[PDB]
Amino acid sequence: HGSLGFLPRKRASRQRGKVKAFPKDDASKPVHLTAFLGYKAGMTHIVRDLDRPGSKMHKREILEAVTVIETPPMVVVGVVGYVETPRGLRSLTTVWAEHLSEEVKRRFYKNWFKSKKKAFTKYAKKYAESTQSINRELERIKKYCSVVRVLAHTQIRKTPLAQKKAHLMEIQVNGGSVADKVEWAREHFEKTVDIKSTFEQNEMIDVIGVTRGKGNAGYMHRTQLNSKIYRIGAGDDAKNASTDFDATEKRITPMGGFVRYGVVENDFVMLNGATPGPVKRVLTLRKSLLTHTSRKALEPVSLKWIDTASKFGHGRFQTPAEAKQFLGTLKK
Amino acid sequence: AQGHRLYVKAKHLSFQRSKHVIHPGTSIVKIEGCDSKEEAQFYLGKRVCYVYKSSKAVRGSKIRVIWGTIARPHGNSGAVRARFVHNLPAKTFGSSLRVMLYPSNI
Amino acid sequence: SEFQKVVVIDAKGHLLGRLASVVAKQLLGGQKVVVVRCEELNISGHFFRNKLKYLAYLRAFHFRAPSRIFQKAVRGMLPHKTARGQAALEHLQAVEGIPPPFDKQKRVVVPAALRVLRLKPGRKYCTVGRLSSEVGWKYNDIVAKLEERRKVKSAAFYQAKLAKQKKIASAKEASPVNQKLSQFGY
RNA sequence: GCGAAACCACAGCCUGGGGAACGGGCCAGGCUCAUACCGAAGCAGAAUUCGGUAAGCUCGUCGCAAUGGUAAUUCAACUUAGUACGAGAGGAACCGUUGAUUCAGAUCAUUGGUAUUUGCGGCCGCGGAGCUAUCAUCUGCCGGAUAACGGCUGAACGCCUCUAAGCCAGAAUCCGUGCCAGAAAGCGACGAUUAUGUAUAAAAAUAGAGGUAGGCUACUCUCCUGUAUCGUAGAAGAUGGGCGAUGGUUGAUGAAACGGAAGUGUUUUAUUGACUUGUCCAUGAAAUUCCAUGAAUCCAUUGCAUACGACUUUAAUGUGGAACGGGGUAUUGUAGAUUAAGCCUUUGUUCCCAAGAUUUG
RNA sequence: UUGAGAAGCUCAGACGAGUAGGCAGGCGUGGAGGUUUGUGACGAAGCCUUGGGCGUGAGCCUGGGUCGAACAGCCUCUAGUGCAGAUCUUGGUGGAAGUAGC
RNA sequence: UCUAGUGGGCCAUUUUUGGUAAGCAGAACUGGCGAUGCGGGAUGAACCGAACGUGAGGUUAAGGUGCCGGAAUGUACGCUCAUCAGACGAAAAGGUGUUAGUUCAU
């Protein structure tokens, strides 16, 4: 409790991470996304040569105890227009999607089954019946706006979680003009967004999230800083855990699933440190507010070997396939 | 449009008071449009009234009137002293008043 | 003299104490007072002098908005401990800039509070909005941006009104009735 | 379930001043060792010292941020450069690296244990998961304003002159900033949903501005407030005849445009409806015969949680969930059992349920 | 002109803090003598009342309700005669408290 | 002639003698409060006015007239810029601090 800033330490109400401060944008910057909702797939120590001129580990093999985040693609079904006012930053209007997925419709509700599935139905009528009204809303946004964000939601069904309400949160469309921001939002409407496009594996990411409660330590929304990305592995990619050095094919998921999380079947990212919250918890990955110019972010990442052993218990083999031939024929 | 308004608009400011003692018997009335004590001499003796409304109706009318008469000027800024048939309530500070043109000497 | 049910006051170039005293007296008169452009209020004295005056106040809630600075001065000149002074405060609306509802309404000024008519020439004075910029207010830049936008639209309306006014002014002397019986001073 | 007694003028936020206490009643208000920075000093440089500055150490869904706390925090070495300085040696600013911390932020992957898998093999030998760690692995700020401090330029003092005008440089400080909350009595967007004329919009200087007009250079006029301008006549405004406008005043709907900020109102009208005191007439209004006028919650589920609720999904006929039957799984351990319990997972099975009530205009 | 409760009526002027203390006149209570050819089961006394009135006041008169057997004004006599206090006396009853607890 | 109560002081004024770190102390002189409310003095028992039946009207005292607050954001001159004014002892002085300047030198 030394840090007076956190005192009085009280648990964050919203489990989902909140992007309180988006990075500054400019017209020259292309329209793109900063914050990406994700889940704590797990964490695993992986070896990597440390390429840093002037460092004492310069071109030296060092094991990197790091963390892997489950990041399913990002479907966007809404846009918000924020207009700057003397009182503050006010939302001019919200334009959701003509067709909303079941998951995002579950978010608006507390339960899906008891209700008569009436979430945004009459809206879906006026959107389809009168597209010109939506055009006026977009026209109103373009003429009067400085900040434009999108109401993108997660696909829970792709994730191995009992969660069914799609986690939704505004993401600024940084770059370009407001009209250009709206044009990109309108064309990417009702479309998924992959985190691999958002982060180039070398860009600077400050992960924000809510930590794990303890029997007011825990459920604290805390913004981690200086956690560089090393690999955005795809779910369909069977070579994500097998880099150039370790060409032996393997999946980031340890055999028998991650510890207290499950298996990973979607896009995942790679970063060091520890993220606030245990496995299978909602996390937000956003671009850094400040352009961190330290050589830790500047240095290229050439990961040497991913580990996938049975972290639960004591795993002596990272993948079953090699252990089949390495160890003798089983009695079965 | 154009109403009737055969009176002059006025406001109830306060009672004839010292720093800590009030005298509700005399009320200080600001006849708006009058700016000096010499100008206030025209309105001396005129009939001033406080028109208000009550939810209960009497004889089919919900409007009640307290009548008064302007007595003398108060200060150099044209405020006058008025005595009403019933002392004006303390809650009518800042409330509007009507100063008639009668009795007339013009 | 004559009053109005609601009054919109332009606080550009008005001294803080002088305007607040007149406004507080008008509020106790039952009038409804709306003060716009609260960030252009002027206070006599060097900007160093008022910075330390506000800094001493910083050392309750320390409001930073210029509108809430003006409301504080008005609040101190009212019997806020009683109901009469409580109702007076609710009849005042102090805002920065000119919001749309009061944009198209006449804005009067108080000569008893104007800085030009009350301050000795060459005296140093500080602007409340400028002073509040380095105490915590962070909307001065945007408030100015809307102000120029409003001025351009307001100027365009004035040109339209002036051009329209030229038509009646030209036709005013066209009618012989004006010259025929102008003996009444009209 | 049975059940006291002490005590009891009345009360119950502070801050000051109130002389005698006065706060509980009254009156006015709220509710500088080091280091960072430089300056001076022979201070050769290193080593530094001193000087200050400096207290850092309805139900929701999704957002904005008024207000606070507070971005880090304490210091180093190598590189820099093994050199500017310096006879040389020792050792420069700045750069990167290695860091040592504190505190905070995390997580149990690495890490060691604790460990109700108290699981297992022989009370022991230990222990997976989970959690924890200066017991582990780790991550951790900003740009200006300026202080001291020294300036440049420039008056008074035709110059000079950190300064009186101005322009500055320069701080671990301050403010911003970032983070942490979020005004229970802040706000926005979005979804579903049982009186007396209440008459007037430039901006701008004022120590000069605007209009007006010519082709920013030359013009002119006005200001000197609104005691202005618009509007105003009728049994509050009648009935007709008109003439004259054949216009004006508007109501009604049918409308398109503009107005983000808090646009919620400005116009443009299209047609129709009437009114018209614009100039006139003919009747009429009085004896009141002097003022009174469908969702959500609970619920079950749920652990992701832990004073208590809260918290957290799921959950109201289908990836339906909840349970097991398990598999996987590692553990201990000599292969076996537990086999997720905060290990994963199930083309397996059955159960219940197209809920049960409450709340809600 | 009737205005002689001569203890009445009437005219005029001045004046108005007040502790200790001094003085005067009044209000109320129990009982006694006299009186009101007094009041009362067609309702005495008592009590209740945001009913009304009188007096500077102590107090007094009265309406309504309740009630059920006695009671009052005037002159005089008399005294166990007037309460907010005495860590007063007796009785009733509260907050603390459904607390401490058993 | 006889007959109740008082038979403390505080503060203030003046006078005072010595004092003596300096303050102060000591007496005496005189009234006010002590028996006394009222307007002002932010407030307050010693300060400024004023001493009291119940009221209507008028006019003032002391003090006030930007707002709280009744009453001129009155007039006519000036002084003051503070980056701690002012408003109601380190205090002596210093000031490339002024304002008015005077006087004397040229």
Provide a short characterization of the protein structure:
Chain A: Residues 8-21 have a biased composition (Basic residues). Chain A: The modification Phosphoserine is found at residues 3, 55, 130, 133, 197, 242, 302. The structure is cut from a larger assembly and holds chains A (332 residues), B (106 residues) and C (186 residues). By secondary structure, chain A is of the alpha+beta class.
Strand content of chain C: 5-15%
Number of helical regions of chain B: 1
Domain module count of chain C: 2
Order of helices and strands of chain B: EEHEEEE
- Which oligomeric form is depicted? part of a larger assembly
Profile the largest sheet of chain B.
6 strands, antiparallel, barrel
Report the total helices of chain C: 8
SSE succession of chain C: EHEEHHHEHEHHH
Quickly count the domains of chain B.
1
The helix content of chain C is 40-55%
Q: How many strand units of chain C?
A: 5
Q: Largest interface, by Cβ-Cβ below 8 angstroms: which chains and how many residues each? A: B-C, 11 and 8 residues
Number of strands of chain B: 6
- Spatial order of the strands forming the largest sheet of chain B: 1-2-5-4-3-6
Structural class of chain B: mainly beta
Global outline of chain B: globular
Which descriptor suits the 3D outline of chain C? globular
PDB class: ribosome
Keywords: 60S Ribosome, nucleophosmin, fkbp, ribosome
Entry title: Ytm1 associated 60S nascent ribosome (-Fkbp39) State 1B
Chain A: 60S ribosomal protein L3-A
How is the secondary structure organized here?
This is part of a larger assembly, with chains A (332 residues), B (106 residues) and C (186 residues).
Chain A: E1 32-33, E2 36-50, E3 60-70, E4 74-84, E5 89-96, H1 102-108, H2 121-129, H3 131-143, E6 147-154, E7 168-174, H4 178-187, E8 191-193, H5 195-198, E9 205-210, E10 221-223, E11 268-272, E12 282-287, H6 295-298, E13 303-305, H7 320-326
Antiparallel strand pairs in A: 1-7, 2-3, 2-12, 2-13, 3-11, 4-5, 4-6, 4-8, 6-7, 9-10, 9-12
Helix pairs in contact in A: 2-3, 3-4
Chain B: E1 7-17, E2 22-31, H1 37-40, E3 47-58, E4 61-74, E5 79-84, E6 96-100
Antiparallel strand pairs in B: 1-2, 1-6, 2-5, 3-4, 3-6, 4-5
Chain C: E1 6-10, H1 16-27, E2 32-36, E3 42-44, H2 47-58, H3 66-76, H4 83-89, E4 92-94, H5 100-103, E5 125-127, H6 128-132, H7 140-174, H8 176-180
Helix pairs in contact in C: 1-3
Chain A binds three RNA strands through strand 2, strand 3, strand 4, strand 5 and helix 2.
